[PDB]
RNA sequence: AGCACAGUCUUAACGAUGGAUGUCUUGGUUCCUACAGCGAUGAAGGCCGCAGCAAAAUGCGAUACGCAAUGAAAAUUGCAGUGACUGAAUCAUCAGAAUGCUGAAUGUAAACUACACCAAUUCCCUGGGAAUAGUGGUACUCCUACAGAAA
RNA sequence: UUUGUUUUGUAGCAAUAGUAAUUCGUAAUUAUCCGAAGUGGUAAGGACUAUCCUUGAAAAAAGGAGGGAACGGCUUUGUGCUUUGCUACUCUUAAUACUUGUAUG
RNA sequence: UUGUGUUGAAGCGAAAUACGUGAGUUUUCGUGGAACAUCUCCCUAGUGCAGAUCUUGGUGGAAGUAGCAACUAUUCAAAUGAGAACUUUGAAGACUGAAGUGGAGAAGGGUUUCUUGUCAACUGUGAUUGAACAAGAGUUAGCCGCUCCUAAGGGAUAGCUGAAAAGUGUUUAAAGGGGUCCCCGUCUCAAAAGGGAAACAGGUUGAUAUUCCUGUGCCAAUAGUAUUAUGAGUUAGAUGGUAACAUAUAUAUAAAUGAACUCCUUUACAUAGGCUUUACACUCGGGGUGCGUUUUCUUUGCACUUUACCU
RNA sequence: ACGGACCAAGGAGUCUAGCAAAUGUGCAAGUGUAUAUGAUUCUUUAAACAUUUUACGCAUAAUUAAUG
RNA sequence: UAAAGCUAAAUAUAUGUAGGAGACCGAUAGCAAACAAGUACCGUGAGGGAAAGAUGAAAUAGUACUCAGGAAUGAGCAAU
RNA sequence: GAUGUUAGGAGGGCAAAUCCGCCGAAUUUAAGCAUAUAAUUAAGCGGAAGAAAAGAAAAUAACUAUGAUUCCUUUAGUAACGGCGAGUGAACAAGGACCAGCUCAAACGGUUAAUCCUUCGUUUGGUGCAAACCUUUCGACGGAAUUGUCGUU
C-alpha cells in the first residue's frame, strides 16, 4: 500500500535493485530474476 | 464423544460475562469504627442502571473521616429510596428504609 | 454461496497473519500472538525439533557467515600469543 | 599514493589533517562521478586505499599510546585486556591447578618417583 | 571499555554523498533557488543543514527530505534569498 | 521441354526431433587418522551495506571484493587504471588495526529506524584550542566486599 | 458627547487570483464578473417526542471552582525575627544584549 | 596372463556366401575421435526386462480437430511503419448513464508510475501496442497520517505451581511521581475508521502536492540574567450590572495574586419519528459577453457571470 | 476378465546374525591361536608373518528335578 | 565397613574441522545439491523442495568479406 | 533481612556424533488380544567435555582364594524372567588393554587462627623488536573466620 514501514520500503527497494540484468562487460567473460505479476515477494 | 457445551462453559473463553458497560461491583461500605459505634450518613446522588442486572444501583457519597474528601459507594437500591436522600449506616442508625443496620 | 468454499472465499484472502520476524528474517512472525512460528523469537531459545532433520540442517551453524568462529579457526595450529606481531624485516 | 611506513613517523595532527584532505578529494571525485564526468573515476580506488592506510596508522598509534597509558595498573579495560576464549579466561590458572597442600607436597618431596634400572 | 580509534560516526564527508543533476534538480536550481543533494539515510534536517553550511558557505531557508527506493536520502535545500543557488551550483559543478 | 493419380502401408539412403550409448569428472560416498566449544571482551543465526563501470555467488564491514604486518615476489587487466629496475602489481600467511543494525540482546519498545533517564561528549597541542544532539552507561538473577538506614 | 439622512467597500482576505471574452510584437492591453426567486436532493446543527427485563466505552489532555499557605522596596541594631531614617513600587506581554553545548518545528 | 589403439579405441547405423540350436559371438562399410579388451585361470557384484493404473524423460494417432460465443457496434479517411480490423489523429454511428470501466482512499501488490527507446519471447488472431524488454528518472509536510491515549485484549514483573518446558498474573510486594514528612502509585504493548494542538486558496511538473512556488494564516515551544517598551494593580492582589451576567481591543483582549488538600465539567457516546435552520446541490426569470440555429419559426438554444482558510 | 498409446534409461530373493544338511579343504582325539602381544614389516601393509613346555569355544560321556 | 567428596589411562564418537585412502558411484548413478543448492519455486504457517555438467589443442583461432533480405536469417567464387 | 547504575565478578544463547539427568509412546510381534513385546526405544525438557560417566568395596567368593573404575575375548543365549506363550536375559571366576591413588567429616593442637581473601605498594631475576608473559617475598590496609580456617593422622 501507500502506507509503508521503513524496513518494508527498504526491502522493496533492495528487491527492485536485485532485479536488474547482468552487466554486459561482465557477460564479456541472471537466473534469480522475478516479475512483479508472476512471482510475489511474499515479504 | 466430544466435550459437551456445559463442559465448555467453564473454560471461560466466550462464556465470560459481558461486562463492558457495567458500572461497578455492588458492595456496601467496608466495616469501620463509625459503623461499629455510631452512624455515618451518605447522600445518594444518583440512581443508575447496571446493564447486567435488573435492580437499580445507588451511588452514595460519604464524607471520609480519616482524611478530608469524599468516597463513592455503589449500593443496591431499595424500593422507595430517592436521589437527595441521606441514608445512615451503623449500629445506631435509625430503623428506616434505606439505612444499613446490624440485623 | 458467492464467496463459496473455493474461489469466492479465496477472493477474501487479504490481511496476512505472518510477517518478517526480525530474528529469523523469515515471514513466520505471527502478528496476533507476537511469536515466530519458525524460531519462536520472543523466547530466548531457538525452537528446534529433532523430528525435522531438514529444518535443523537448513538453519544450523555454518549455514551463515560464521563471522567470528571462522576467524578463531586455525588459531590452534599457530598458538600466537595475543598482541604478538611477526618480526619486522 | 602514500605508503604506511612514510607516515608512521607523523604526529597525530599531520595524520588527521592529511586524512581530512584525502576525504575532501575523495568527495570531489565522487561529485565528479555523479556529474557526467567519468575521466577521473579510476582514482577513487587509490584515494580510498590511501584513506584506509592513514586510518590504519592513526588507529594503531592511538591503540599503542592507550596501552602505554594503561601499562600495568592491573585493571585495564576489557578491550585492552586479553581476548582469549571465554572458557580459557574462566579456566583455573596453572598455578591454581598445580597447587597442592602441605601434606601431599611434603609427601611427594620425600618420596618422589625416581629413575632406576633392572639388571 | 575504552575506544581509541577515531570516531566513525557520519561526518560531513559521508552525510552528503553528491549533488543530484537530473532534469528536475537542474531546473529547480534556477526556478526556485534550491539545490538537490543525495545523502545517507541516517542524516536528518539538522544534519544536512549544518553539513551543507560547513561544506559550502551557504545557509538554507529550509531542507525537505525524502527516502528514495535506491537506499539513499534526497534533500531539497532551499537556499536563502540572500545569495543565489545558480552561482554556488556553478562553483561546485 | 515432357512424364509420373492421390492417399495408406513396407524397405533402403540421407536428414529433422530427441538426448540414449560410449568416453570423460575440481563431485559424492564409505573407511581410517588427528584435533575440538563458541558466547555479555556480545556467539550462532538474521538483516543492511561495500567495487569506477557490479545482479548473483564468493569476500568483506563506513579503513567494507579489502588496511597494516610477514613470506614470495612481477604482474593485474573486459575497458579504465595501478605497478620495480622491491613495505608498491598479484598471491600466500595472518598475530596488529578495524569489525554497520540486530540477535542470549540486556534502558523501555517494536509490521515504530518510536521514547526515556544519568554523565555533556570527542578530538588536537604540551594548561590551552577546536568540533560535536554526537559518545558511553542504565535488564534479570546470583556471589564477595562495602554503604547508610531498621529491633 | 446621543438620535435620525447620504457616499464608499464584493467587510478585511479580494482581484493582484480565477473564469468567459476583445485586441496587440508574439509577453502586454481593455471590458464583465450584478438584479431578483423557486424545488427540497444531500449534509450538519437545533429544540423535541417516543422505545428498552437492551440505558447504549475509557484514558491521555484541558478547564472551572471550594480553600486561604507566602508576602513592598533602600539602609541599619542585636539574634529569618522587634527595631531606627526615606519611598514612588509588583506582575504581564514584546524586543534586544550577554551567559547557557549549537536557544524552532 | 597377453594383447589392440591417431595407419583411429569405445560407442552408434546399416549389413555378412560368417559361426552357433540358442542366448550370442565374430567380421564389413559408414560415422566417431580416445581409449579398449583378455575365453589363460580365478575373484567379485547395485549383473541381464515387455508388462508392475511401474519411475523419470522424450514422442505420437486423436488433429490443423474441439475450439478462440458473457459484456448491443462499428464505419470512413489520414499518419507511422517492412508489415495495420484490434498503434495514433480527424470525421461519423454508438455505449457507460453519476448504484459509472467517473473521481478519491483502505487491505493486498511493489515500481506495474514517468520519459525515451524498443519487439527474442509474452501480450491464446495481428500488433509498429503494452502492466513485456532496456536505459534513465520520479515520491519534498510543524498543519495529511503514524508517532500520544485508552478498549476488546496481548506480553512481562511479584509470587505460586511444574523435572523443566511452561501455566496463572497481587493470590504474605519493603514495587516511580508530587509537594515538603506525608500523599498518590505494577510495567509495557494493542485503533492509519474510537479520543486527538494547528492550513487555506491560486499556480506549478513528464512523473509529487493541503508536502513544491506565491500570498495569507494557525498551533506548539521558547532557559537564566539585565535592559528597554506595553499595559494593568499598588500608599497584599481591578471594576461595572438589581439580576441573568459583563469588562483588559496594548501591532497582540497578555496580566483581575493565590500554596497544600478537595469537588466538579469537557473529552463522552443508543435507537426511532417527525418539525425546523443553514450551507452545498438543482432549477426559474432579468442584465452583460461569446457561440450555435436561421428553407421557415424563434426578443431564441447553450456556456461564463466565481470568492477559500483566517480576522 | 484386469494391465499395456509409443520409445529410451532405471526397475525387484539381497545383506547380516544364527542353525543344519550337502560338498570341497586342512588337521585329527583333538581342532580353532580369541582378545592381545612382537617385529630393522610400516606406499601397498587396514595385509602378510609370528606366539618361553593347563585362556576360552566345540568335541572327547551319559543320565537325573536333584544331593549326584 | 553405607548414608560426604576428588581422580589420569585403557573406551565412544551418523558433529565440526583437517589430512589419507577404496575390488564404491560415474550426471535418472553418487549427498537433495559435480552448476549461482537447501538455490529457484510452492505453502498463511509448521514445512515442502527441484531441474540444470562436456565446442575446440588453442577462441591470445567464437565465424572476417560479398550477395539477397526491413530484419531474422540464407547462400557463396568468401572464411578459422 | 531489605535497599543501592557502590567496587569486582558469574549465569543466560548457539552447537550434539560420542556423553550425563528427567520424561515418555504407539506402530510392531504374539498369526486375534488385554499381561508381555516393541522399549527402560522414538518424540519432548534440561546439562557437560575433548572425551563424559564410573571409580578406590557396607565388592566377590567359599578357593591353595581374589582386590578401585572402564573397555575387549569369554562366561552365555547360560542362571533366570515370561498368557512359562511369543519372547526376554544378567552376574562371578578366566584371558587381555590400561593401571593410581587420594581428602573432607570425626580425632588431636589454645603460653594464644598457627588460617583465607580484597586493595595498595617493594624487589629476585628471566625469555619478547614490541605487545605482552613467566618467576619474586618484604609488607601495610580493609575484611572473612572460634556458629571453626589451617596443621597432624
From TrEMBL, chain A:
Pfam families, per database record: Ribosomal_L39
UniProt record, GO biological process: translation
Transmembrane segments: none
Record's GO cellular component terms: cytosolic large ribosomal subunit
Molecular function via GO: structural constituent of ribosome
Alphabetic keyword roster: Ribonucleoprotein, Ribosomal protein
Keyword field contains Ribonucleoprotein: yes
Keyword Ribosomal protein: yes
UniProt record similarity statement: Belongs to the eukaryotic ribosomal protein eL39 family.
Protein name: 60S ribosomal protein L39
From TrEMBL, chain B:
Domain Large ribosomal subunit protein uL2 RNA-binding: residue ranges: 10-89
Highest taxon, organism lineage: Eukaryota
Organism from which the protein derives: Plasmodium falciparum (isolate 3D7)
Name the record gives this protein: 60S ribosomal protein L2
Coiled coil residues, start to end: none
Stretches the record annotates as Disordered: 1-19
UniProt record similarity statement: Belongs to the universal ribosomal protein uL2 family.
Automatic annotation (TrEMBL), chain C:
Ribosomal protein in keyword set: yes
Keywords: Metal-binding, Ribonucleoprotein, Ribosomal protein, RNA-binding, rRNA-binding, Zinc, Zinc-finger
UniProt: Mg(2+) binding residues: 32
Domain of life the protein comes from: Eukaryota
Binding site for Zn(2+) 1: 21, 24, 36, 39
GO MF annotation: an example: rRNA binding
Binding site for Zn(2+) 2: 21, 36
Gene3D superfamilies, A to Z: 2.20.25.30
One Gene Ontology biological process: translation
One CC-aspect GO term: cytosolic large ribosomal subunit
Signal peptide residues on this chain, from the entry's feature table: none
Stated role: Component of the large ribosomal subunit. The ribosome is a large ribonucleoprotein complex responsible for the synthesis of proteins in the cell.
Family listed: Belongs to the eukaryotic ribosomal protein eL37 family.
Name of the protein: Ribosomal protein L37
Gene source species: Plasmodium falciparum (isolate 3D7)
TrEMBL record, chain D:
GO biological process: maturation of LSU-rRNA from tricistronic rRNA transcript (SSU-rRNA, 5.8S rRNA, LSU-rRNA); translation
Gene Ontology, cellular component aspect: cytosolic large ribosomal subunit; large ribosomal subunit
InterPro entries: Ribosomal_uL29, Ribosomal_uL29_euk, Ribosomal_uL29_sf
Keyword set, alphabetical order: Coiled coil, Ribonucleoprotein, Ribosomal protein
Keyword Ribonucleoprotein: yes
GO molecular function list: mRNA binding; structural constituent of ribosome
Residues forming coiled coils: 5-32
Source taxon at top rank: Eukaryota
Family: Belongs to the universal ribosomal protein uL29 family.
Protein name: 60S ribosomal protein L35, putative
Amino acid at each position: 500500500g501507500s502506507i509503508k514501514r521503513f524496513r518494508l520500503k527498504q526491502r522493496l527497494g533492495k528487491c527492485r535493485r536485485q532485479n536488474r540484468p547482468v552487466p554486459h562487460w561482465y557477460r564479456l567473460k541472471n537466473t534469480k530474476r522475478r516479475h512483479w505479476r508472476r512471482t510475489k515477494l511474499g515479504l | 464423544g466430544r466435550v459437551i457445551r456445559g463442559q465448555r462453559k467453564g473454560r471461560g473463553s466466550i462464556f465470560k460475562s459481558h461486562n463492558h458497560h457495567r458500572k461497578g461491583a455492588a458492595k456496601l461500605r467496608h466495616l469501620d469504627y463509625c459503623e461499629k459505634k455510631g452512624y455515618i450518613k451518605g447522600l445518594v446522588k444518583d440512581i443508575i442502571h447496571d446493564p447486567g442486572r435488573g435492580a437499580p444501583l445507588a451511588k452514595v457519597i460519604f464524607k471520609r473521616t480519616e482524611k478530608y474528601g469524599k468516597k463513592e459507594e455503589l449500593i443496591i437500591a431499595s424500593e422507595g429510596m430517592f436521589t437527595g436522600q441521606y441514608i445512615s449506616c451503623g449500629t445506631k442508625a435509625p430503623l428506616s428504609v434505606g439505612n444499613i443496620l446490624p440485623i | 454461496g458467492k464467496a463459496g468454499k473455493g474461489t469466492g472465499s479465496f477472493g477474501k484472502r487479504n490481511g496476512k497473519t505472518h510477517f518478517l520476524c526480525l530474528r529469523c528474517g523469515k515471514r513466520s512472525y505471527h502478528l496476533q500472538k507476537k511469536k515466530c512460528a519458525s524460531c519462536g523469537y520472543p523466547s530466548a531459545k531457538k525452537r528446534r525439533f529433532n523430528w525435522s532433520v531438514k529444518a535443523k540442517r537448513r538453519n544450523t551453524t555454518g549455514t551463515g557467515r560464521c563471522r567470528y568462529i571462522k576467524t578463531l579457526r586455525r588459531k590452534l595450529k599457530n598458538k600466537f600469543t595475543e598482541g604478538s606481531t611477526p618480526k619486522p624485516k | 599514493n602514500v605508503k604506511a611506513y612514510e607516515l608512521r613517523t607523523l604526529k597525530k595532527k599531520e595524520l588527521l589533517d592529511k586524512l581530512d584532505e584525502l576525504k575532501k578529494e575523495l568527495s570531489g571525485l565522487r561529485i565528479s562521478k555523479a556529474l557526467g564526468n567519468s575521466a577521473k573515476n579510476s582514482k577513487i580506488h587509490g584515494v580510498r586505499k590511501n584513506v584506509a592506510r592513514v586510518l590504519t596508522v592513526y588507529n594503531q598509534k592511538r591503540k599503542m599510546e592507550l596501552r602505554q597509558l594503561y601499562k600495568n595498573k592491573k585493571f585495564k579495560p576489557y578491550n585492552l585486556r586479553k581476548k582469549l576464549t571465554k572458557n580459557k579466561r574462566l579456566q583455573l590458572s596453572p598455578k591454581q591447578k598445580a597447587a597442592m597442600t602441605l601434606r601431599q607436597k611434603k609427601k611427594v618431596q620425600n618420596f618422589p618417583q625416581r629413575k632406576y634400572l633392572v639388571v | 571499555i575504552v575506544k581509541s580509534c577515531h570516531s566513525k560516526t557520519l561526518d560531513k564527508y559521508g552525510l552528503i554523498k553528491y549533488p543530484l543533476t537530473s532534469e528536475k534538480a537542474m531546473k529547480k536550481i534556477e526556478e526556485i533557488n534550491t539545490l538537490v543533494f543525495m545523502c545517507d539515510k541516517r542524516a536528518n534536517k539538522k544534519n544536512i543543514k549544518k553539513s551543507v553550511k560547513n561544506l559550502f558557505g551557504i545557509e538554507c531557508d529550509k531542507v525537505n527530505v525524502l527516502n528514495t527506493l535506491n537506499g539513499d536520502k534526497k534533500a531539497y535545500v532551499r537556499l536563502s534569498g540572500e545569495h543565489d543557488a545558480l552561482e554556488v551550483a556553478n562553483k561546485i559543478g
